[PDB]
Structure 1
Amino acid sequence: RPVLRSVNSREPSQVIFCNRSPRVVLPVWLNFDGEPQPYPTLPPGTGRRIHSYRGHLWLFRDAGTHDGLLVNQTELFVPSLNVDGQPIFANITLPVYTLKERCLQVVRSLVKPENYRRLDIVRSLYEDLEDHPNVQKDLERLTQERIAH
């Protein structure tokens, strides 16, 4: 029903997740109803073979903070059929975050949420700190972006 969901192609596709980021990476599979399911995490510099399927949908996040990451320099990864038995590479990297978002990342990592409002900063930043990264907001944005085109 949702635009962004895995399709039950039942066509096997071998994939290699390669973490070329400095974060611990959480692979997230969008199931057939478009709901996120987590898979075991990947340390920096590590690669791992996965048995996935043509037309399944993946995204990749910081396992601890849920910051969004890039896969093959984009947001969503979709396996195709292997050619020559060669696995398909999903190379995970850091996006160029805005300076604001990167600062929010660092502050969030050092301040408990119940203490955001104890910080002596401009008031509008409180909501900014509290609007944590998360898969559902990104999927909304990507869905509208897929409609547009």
Structure 2
Amino acid sequence: LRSVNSREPSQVIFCNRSPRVVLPVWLNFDGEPQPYPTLPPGTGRRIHSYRGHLWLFRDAGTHDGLLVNQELFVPSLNPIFANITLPVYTLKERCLQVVRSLVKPLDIVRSLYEDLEDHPNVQKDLER
């Protein structure tokens, strides 16, 4: 997974249709994730990228996974609209989310202690 160094510019608008502070993540030419500055919820940002580049986005406080035009966004030839939405999380993950966010890293099974500690991670999702 790496941006394709096309040098063909590509005009993109980062539209934030989620109640989360979005963190855009560009996958540079070696596949490493590069963090761009964040979009408050409901705010947009016209941005300059290139055909064949690799973008993903996360909640920027918890790294929860968001959708862009419903997982990986590649600017194609022209501007282009990257619509960043909440996914329909599982009920389990959604509860992991709420719990995570109210307790610093309790009365639940041992298998759930691990789930709560298996934070969403960008390096993690990438291998997938």
Runs of 4+ in 1 over 2 A off after TM superposition: none
Q: Which has the higher helix share?
A: 1
What CA distance in whole angstroms lies between the structure 2 residues aligned with 1:136 and 1:34? 10
What CA distance in whole angstroms lies between the structure 2 residues aligned with 1:129 and 1:47? 32
What CA distance in whole angstroms lies between the structure 1 residues aligned with 2:89 and 2:47? 28
Q: CA deviation at 1:81?
A: 1.3
Q: CA deviation at 1:137?
A: 1.6
The aligned counterpart of 1:67 is 64
- Of residues 14, 38, 41, the one that matches 1:44 is 41
Q: CA deviation at 1:88?
A: 0.2
Q: CA deviation at 1:15?
A: 0.1
1:89 matches 2:81:
yes
Q: CA deviation at 1:89?
A: 0.1
SS of corresponding position for 2:73: coil
What CA distance in whole angstroms lies between the structure 2 residues aligned with 1:91 and 1:23? 13
Q: CA deviation at 1:138?
A: 1.1
Q: CA deviation at 1:122?
A: 1.1
Count residues in correspondence: 128
Cα deviation, 1:37-91, whole Å, max 9, x if unaligned, reads: 1001001111110000000000000000000000001x10000111xxxx10000
What CA distance in whole angstroms lies between the structure 1 residues aligned with 2:89 and 2:125? 15
CA RMSD of aligned residues (A): 1.3
What CA distance in whole angstroms lies between the structure 2 residues aligned with 1:34 and 1:56? 10
SS of corresponding position for 1:104: helix
What CA distance in whole angstroms lies between the structure 2 residues aligned with 1:27 and 1:136? 14
Tell me the TM-score normalized by structure 2.
0.98
What CA distance in whole angstroms lies between the structure 2 residues aligned with 1:33 and 1:111? 36
Tell me the TM-score normalized by structure 1.
0.84
Q: CA deviation at 1:32?
A: 0.3
Q: Identity over the aligned pairs, expressed in percent?
A: 99
Q: CA deviation at 1:29?
A: 0.3
The aligned counterpart of 2:8 is 11
Unaligned runs of 5+ in 2: none
Unaligned runs of 5+ in 1: 114-118, 141-148
Q: CA deviation at 1:11?
A: 0.5
